[PDB]
Amino acid sequence: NPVWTALFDYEPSGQDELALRKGDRVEVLSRDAAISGDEGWWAGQVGGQVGIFPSNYVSRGGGPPPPGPAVAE
């Protein structure tokens, strides 16, 4: 299990979503949508809580992510 780092705060919109704070070390349990329930969301663990969170909210080492395509809403 690789441990990624949170780039931003994330406030959950439900009980299945994992709250993130910038700097959190996140243990990534599954990058697969068959587990997370949604493309682009991963399953992980922080502080003994497990839940899903957005994959664009973490980076391998906590520095800026690889330069490339953004997300629309």
From Swiss-Prot:
Outline what the protein does. Answer: Activates the JUN N-terminal pathway. Required for serum-stimulated cell proliferation and for mitogen and cytokine activation of MAPK14 (p38), MAPK3 (ERK) and MAPK8 (JNK1) through phosphorylation and activation of MAP2K4/MKK4 and MAP2K7/MKK7. Plays a role in mitogen-stimulated phosphorylation and activation of BRAF, but does not phosphorylate BRAF directly. Influences microtubule organization during the cell cycle.
Q: Which organism is it from?
A: Homo sapiens
Q: How is it modified after translation?
A: Autophosphorylation on serine and threonine residues within the activation loop plays a role in enzyme activation.
* Domain called SH3: residue spans: 1-63
Entry's localization field = Cytoplasm, Cytoskeleton, Microtubule organizing center, Centrosome
Q: What is this protein called?
A: Mitogen-activated protein kinase kinase kinase 11
Q: Subunit details for this protein?
A: Homodimer; undergoes dimerization during activation. Interacts with MAP2K4/MKK4. Interacts with MAP2K7/MKK7. Found in a complex with SH3RF1, RAC1, MAP2K7/MKK7, MAPK8IP1/JIP1 and MAPK8/JNK1.
**What is the tissue localization of expression for this protein?**
Expressed in a wide variety of normal and neoplastic tissues including fetal lung, liver, heart and kidney, and adult lung, liver, heart, kidney, placenta, skeletal muscle, pancreas and brain.
Portion of the parent chain present: 43 to 108 of 847
Its family remark reads: Belongs to the protein kinase superfamily. STE Ser/Thr protein kinase family. MAP kinase kinase kinase subfamily.
